[PDB]
Amino acid sequence: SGAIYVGNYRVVNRHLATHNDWANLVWEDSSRDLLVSSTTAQGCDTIARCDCQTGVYYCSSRRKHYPVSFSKPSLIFVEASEYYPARYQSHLMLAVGHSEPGDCGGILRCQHGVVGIVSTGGNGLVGFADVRDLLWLDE
């Protein structure tokens, strides 16, 4: 679990969005596993606008943060799950690090701000949905 709170927006994994997220929908994209909903309270986070490929993510299944080197956002095949059919997920960045399904939502940050959230993983892999291209989250 986990969310980014920026301005009057809440960014979550689309597959973990609540009834309230859908009732306050701003934008969603199944191909990116992202959903953004509106909030009444002002957020606590700021978004990176950069090309970093290193950062630190929060891993809930270890109650710890880990440093990572990750690929640039790209279109990557993701096998079928309970939430989606087998498909290509776009704007996904992969890295070597620990993750389990419940780790989705953990934030990845670089020195400039929030980069994205955990969205996929595998045997010693962790994948992050990028949010740096969503300029309207502040603008």
Ligand SMILES: CSc1ccccc1CC(=O)N1C[C@@H](C)C[C@H](C(N)=O)C1
């Ligand atoms: C951190 S998720 C994870 C970690 C280790 C092993 C397996 C997973 C599960 C995983 O990759 N997916 C299943 C589900 C959570 C939806 C995800 C998606 N964005 O399509 C894909």
Ligand SMILES: [Zn+2]
């Ligand atoms: Zn950066």
